[PDB]
Amino acid sequence: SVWKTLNKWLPPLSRDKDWWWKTLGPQINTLLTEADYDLNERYEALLLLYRWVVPEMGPRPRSSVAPSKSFMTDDHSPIEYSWKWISGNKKPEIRYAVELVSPLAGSKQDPFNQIPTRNLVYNLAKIIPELDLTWFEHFWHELLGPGSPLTKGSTVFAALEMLHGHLSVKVYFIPVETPDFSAWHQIKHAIEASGCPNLEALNHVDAYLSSHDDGRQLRPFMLAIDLVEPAASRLKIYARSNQTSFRFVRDVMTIGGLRTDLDRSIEKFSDLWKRALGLDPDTPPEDELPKVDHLTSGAVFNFDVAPKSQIPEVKAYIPVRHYANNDLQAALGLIGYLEDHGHGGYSQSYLRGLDMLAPSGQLDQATGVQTYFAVACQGEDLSLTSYLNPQFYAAFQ
Ligand SMILES: N[C@@H](Cc1c[nH]c2ccccc12)C(=O)O
């Protein structure tokens, strides 16, 4: 084991740092091993974890109660893994998002816990010069700086994507809302001041959000960027709705019909939706889901409005934790879909990863491990991603 070797030879850590090391290291290491990552990349990932992430995770969990109301997950776990299914039986992509913390969190010196993520990004910029911080600094200044202004629990976090051979970094900004400045207002002004050459996709999304009947029901809340050249980065605007019928999801995926030639992709999406969510196969698409009242309940989407494209791209997130019956049932639904379409070469590796992450004896009894199933429509096929919560506090061992 890579983690066993590193833990055996790297210098020992404080109580909190050692807890985070001996918890995250095995999790990330198992996920990467099941995805058949090369040994060098597992070493690199765990060395990054030991050097730049573990020292900034703050106190270790010691009870069911979290030290913050972090927006990363529902139990405020500050770490979220993700497992992207690659078509053609290729190796899955492993990513993880983290919101680092400091003792100044909540104080006047960092009221929204922003400096640790900035520090992490700059450290990574020292090790990987390929990363570009132009758009990072621009959107940070626009959305979280002293000129920026109700909070969702966090205002920023970062994500590492191990893309087999190189590392990519992503930044999520969650603006603070005021009666005069909605999150969407701030995001739109930030993108307009970003310096993009072709704002056709942003204007399409704005028209859909403002004038369309169902598009008016989406509440923008988050913006994600890639730390690459601004011409090569995506601009992902996340939007939530209390509506949950599959008809609504179907229309949002098309952006009110702006996107065409997706009927087969949408039929496969409906099949996967009912399988993962445990619904009856004859569920009318206009039926709403049984009501779940939560901060992150309802249907979630993201629009990619990156200038390279004139038409925006939509990714939908099936909220497994809120509407499925249990983690094993949803996992088998997703896995059966993948097997029916010849894309399930890594299903058993995924199940071993789930069993690694799951609180002892709760996969078939509760939800929570799998937060989202992300679906995108690529021509006739689906691009799928599983999002995973280690549940440090909801499942405190
Ligand atoms: N925790 C928030 C934000 C979030 C974290 N990871 C996500 C992945 C997809 C969509 C949203 C999120 C939520 O569940 O909504």
Curated annotation (Swiss-Prot):
Residues annotated as binding L-tryptophan: F71, M72, E80, R240, Y372
Example GO biological process: alkaloid metabolic process
UniProt entry keywords in alphabetical sequence: Transferase
Domain of life of the organism encoding this protein: Eukaryota
Gene Ontology molecular functions: transferase activity, transferring alkyl or aryl (other than methyl) groups
Binding sites annotated in the UniProt record for dimethylallyl diphosphate: R95, K170, Y172, R234, K236, Y238, K315, Y317
Binding of L-tyrosine, residues: F71, R240, Y372
A Pfam cross-reference name: Trp_DMAT
Effect of deleting the gene: Impairs the production of r-N-DMAT and ac-r-N-DMAT.
Protein name: Dimethylallyltryptophan synthase 1
Species this chain originates from: Gibberella fujikuroi (strain CBS 195.34 / IMI 58289 / NRRL A-6831) (Bakanae and foot rot disease fungus)
Lineage: Eukaryota, Fungi, Dikarya, Ascomycota, Pezizomycotina
